[PDB]
Every structure is written in structure tokens, then in C-alpha cells.
Nucleic acid binder design. Sequence first.
DNA 1: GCATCCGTGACAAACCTTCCAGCAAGGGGAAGGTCAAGAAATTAAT
Length: 79
Amino acid sequence: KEMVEANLRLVISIAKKYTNRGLQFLDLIQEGNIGLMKAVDKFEYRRGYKFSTYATWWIRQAITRSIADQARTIRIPVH
DNA sequence: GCATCCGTGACAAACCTTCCAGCAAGGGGAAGGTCAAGAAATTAAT
């Protein structure tokens, strides 16, 4: 909880590059929230990296997944 | 018990799984479509 609450600035700073008129801001924010929640258990911090750098890829994956599944009436898949 | 603030009308990029249609070059099963034999039903001799 404190890990995901200390890094909401990460999702609200990464959600600037995908602010198109397909979805609202809050859906992308809460999809990046579950992407960061997956990155918490996928972190494995013993390599010596920061959480923002590895969490950026997971949150961008969740953002692309939300813009692929949602933001379109005809649901076109992610590929 | 009185002044004052909101509804509401306005002709990215790779990575990996399952699932399904095509072209070989066609055969076979299920299901539905047409030809030559004998049997019903009519008539011209008493």
C-alpha cells in the first residue's frame, strides 16, 4: 500500500503521453495502478535497480492494454 | 424569519500460448435430388 501510494506521481507523470480522446484520464491512471501492483511482485530488487525504471515498462504495458481493449467501440485486439 | 448560491427552461517493442482458414490433390459419409421395372384405374367385346 505504501509502495503504490508513494508512486502515484509515476502514473500521473507517465499518463501525459497518452492523453488522446479515446479514454478519460482516470481509467488510464487506475490501469497503471494495477500495472504498478503487478510490478511490485515482479520487481525483485536484489539486482540493484530503481522501481520507477522497471515500473515504467509495466505501466506502459497496462496503458497500451487499456488503449487497445477500451477506447474503441469495435474492440480491436492488442496486436 | 430574510439575503444569497446552484439546477433548468430557452417556437512502444518485442516475446510466448491457443484457435481457425487455405492449398495442395483429393476420398468418403450424410442428406438430399432424378431414370426404367412392375402394380392401381379406365374402356370396348358380349
